[PDB]
Design an enzyme around this catalytic site. Structure first.
Site, short mmCIF file in Angstrom:
data_model
loop_
_atom_site.label_atom_id
_atom_site.label_comp_id
_atom_site.label_asym_id
_atom_site.label_seq_id
_atom_site.Cartn_x
_atom_site.Cartn_y
_atom_site.Cartn_z
N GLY A 3 0.96 -1.24 0.24
CA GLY A 3 0.23 -0.47 0.12
C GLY A 3 0.70 1.34 0.04
O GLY A 3 2.41 1.55 -0.57
N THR A 4 -0.19 2.83 -0.01
CA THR A 4 0.03 3.57 0.06
C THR A 4 1.33 4.02 2.17
O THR A 4 2.01 5.45 1.46
CB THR A 4 -0.08 4.86 -0.16
OG1 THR A 4 -1.90 4.78 0.53
CG2 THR A 4 -0.78 4.23 -1.96
N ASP A 24 -8.14 9.93 -0.09
CA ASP A 24 -7.80 9.41 -0.75
C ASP A 24 -8.24 7.97 -1.27
O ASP A 24 -7.63 7.06 -1.44
CB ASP A 24 -6.11 8.88 -0.37
CG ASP A 24 -5.62 7.92 -1.37
OD1 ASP A 24 -5.62 9.12 -1.98
OD2 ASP A 24 -4.08 7.60 -0.71
N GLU A 36 -10.01 -6.05 9.27
CA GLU A 36 -11.05 -7.06 8.44
C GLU A 36 -10.61 -7.48 7.39
O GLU A 36 -10.70 -6.20 6.73
CB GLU A 36 -13.23 -6.99 8.85
CG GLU A 36 -12.93 -6.20 7.93
CD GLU A 36 -14.07 -5.80 7.30
OE1 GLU A 36 -15.47 -6.40 7.10
OE2 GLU A 36 -15.30 -4.90 8.37
N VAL A 53 4.23 -2.59 3.66
CA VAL A 53 3.41 -4.03 3.16
C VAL A 53 2.04 -4.21 3.50
O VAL A 53 2.11 -4.37 5.35
CB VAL A 53 4.52 -4.89 3.50
CG1 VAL A 53 4.69 -5.96 2.76
CG2 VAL A 53 5.50 -4.52 2.80
N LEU A 85 -11.25 -8.31 3.30
CA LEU A 85 -12.31 -8.98 2.37
C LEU A 85 -11.06 -9.53 1.12
O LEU A 85 -9.70 -9.04 0.91
CB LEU A 85 -12.97 -7.55 1.94
CG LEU A 85 -14.05 -6.99 2.71
CD1 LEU A 85 -13.56 -6.59 4.22
CD2 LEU A 85 -15.05 -6.87 2.08
N1 LIG Z 1 -8.61 -5.62 4.34
C1 LIG Z 1 -8.19 -6.04 2.63
O1 LIG Z 1 -8.17 -7.24 2.84
C2 LIG Z 1 -7.32 -5.51 2.19
C3 LIG Z 1 -6.25 -4.57 2.67
C4 LIG Z 1 -5.38 -4.26 1.66
N2 LIG Z 1 -4.08 -3.46 2.17
O2 LIG Z 1 -4.66 -2.67 3.63
O3 LIG Z 1 -3.69 -2.39 1.19
C5 LIG Z 1 -5.37 -4.38 0.07
C6 LIG Z 1 -6.24 -5.29 -0.65
C7 LIG Z 1 -6.97 -6.03 0.99
N3 LIG Z 1 -8.37 -6.51 0.52
C8 LIG Z 1 -8.51 -7.05 -1.41
C9 LIG Z 1 -7.30 -8.92 -1.75
C10 LIG Z 1 -7.59 -9.38 -0.40
N4 LIG Z 1 -6.38 -10.59 -1.35
C11 LIG Z 1 -5.80 -10.57 -2.46
C12 LIG Z 1 -6.99 -10.13 -3.54
N5 LIG Z 1 -7.31 -8.56 -2.94
#
Ligand SMILES: NC(=O)c1cc([N+](=O)[O-])ccc1NCc1cnccn1
EC number: 2.7.11.22
Length: 294
Positions: free
Chosen positions: A13-14, A123, A77, A17, A79
């Site tokens: 992410g921004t 953002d 949580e 990791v 997703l």
């Molecule tokens: N809270 C999350 O579930 C989640 C968190 C981040 N992040 O903090 O950068 C990025 C994607 C996410 N889900 C979508 C996701 C998860 N696994 C594979 C593909 N997409």
């Protein structure tokens, strides 16, 4: 860390990791974010801790904040998919209108909630919107930009997108309002409809000029005070506003009307999340189940 068994890297992410991880004791599967340095503003930790109380069905729940060794971990949580990924996967036939409408409606309920609690996202972008198999969509990273700051990249050479940034931010206004989130959501709404980013700027000035080229260069008539903003230049080219019907075809007039109110230049005229929920566009809103391949 050691209480969590990393299932895999969900990305970078921004901020830092992100890993998908399982709590060895609760068995719960979560998203663990390692925040980027040498002290961790105590002000930052208090702000973040306040966000753990910000609970709503359309807001990704912040389960825990862990501060140790100049490292700050945020447990969220989990997703399985974000809207950017879903849109790419739906590029050939497009996301059906009932689903676009359901998603917009849920996102606005989420914004209305955060805004009534004086929390701003700042953002918003497709990758920050997470979806599940139940047809739900949730806003991730609410309030982090404030508890931290605006990035030039992420944490290690990574181009942060400006595609969804409100014009008041681009013009150097130091105080953002809840209106910046409505702007970003309007850009996302348009993108779901047309299947192409509305304003894909590749620099701050290109971002601004792409907006001006479509919505017209703002002036004192449509945006009182704009010419006095920090980065406003009298030398900006003067482009005429384009017909909205050419912007998000083939969106119907209810949809175009709502989008136009979400993209008003003046942050004060821009529609609020609450008022947008009452817009005629949501008269026949429903909750369809998306087809997700995980
Ligand atoms: N809270 C999350 O579930 C989640 C968190 C981040 N992040 O903090 O950068 C990025 C994607 C996410 N889900 C979508 C996701 C998860 N696994 C594979 C593909 N997409």
């Amino acid at each position: 860390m050691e209480n969590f068994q990393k299932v895999e890297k969900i990305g970078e992410g921004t901020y830092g990791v992100v890993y998908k991880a399982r709590n060895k004791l609760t068995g719960e599967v979560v998203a663990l974010k390692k925040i980027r340095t040498e002290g961790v503003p105590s002000t930052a930790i208090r702000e973040i801790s306040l966000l753990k109380e910000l609970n709503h069905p359309n807001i990704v729940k912040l389960l825990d904040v862990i501060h140790t060794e100049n490292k700050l971990y945020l447990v969220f949580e989990f997703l399985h998919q974000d809207l950017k990924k879903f849109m790419d996967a739906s590029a050939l036939t497009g996301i059906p209108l009932p689903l676009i409408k359901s998603y917009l409606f849920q996102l606005l309920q989420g914004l209305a909630f955060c805004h009534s609690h004086r929390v701003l996202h700042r953002d918003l972008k497709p990758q920050n919107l997470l979806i599940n198999t139940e047809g739900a969509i949730k806003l991730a990273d609410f309030g982090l930009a404030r508890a931290f700051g605006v990035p030039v990249r992420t944490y290690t050479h990574e181009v942060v997108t400006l595609w969804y940034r409100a014009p008041e931010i681009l013009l150097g206004c130091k105080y953002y309002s809840t209106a910046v989130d409505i702007w970003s959501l309007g850009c996302i709404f348009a993108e779901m409809v047309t299947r192409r980013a509305l304003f894909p700027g590749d620099s701050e000035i290109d971002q601004l000029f792409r907006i001006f080229r479509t919505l017209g260069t703002p002036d004192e008539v449509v945006w009182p005070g704009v010419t006095s903003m920090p980065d406003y230049k009298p030398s900006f080219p003067k482009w005429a506003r384009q017909d909205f019907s050419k912007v998000v075809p083939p969106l119907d007039e209810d949809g175009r009307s709502l989008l136009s109110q979400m993209l008003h230049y003046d942050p004060n005229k821009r529609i609020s999340a609450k008022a947008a929920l009452a817009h005629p566009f949501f008269q026949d809103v429903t909750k369809p189940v998306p087809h997700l391949r995980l």
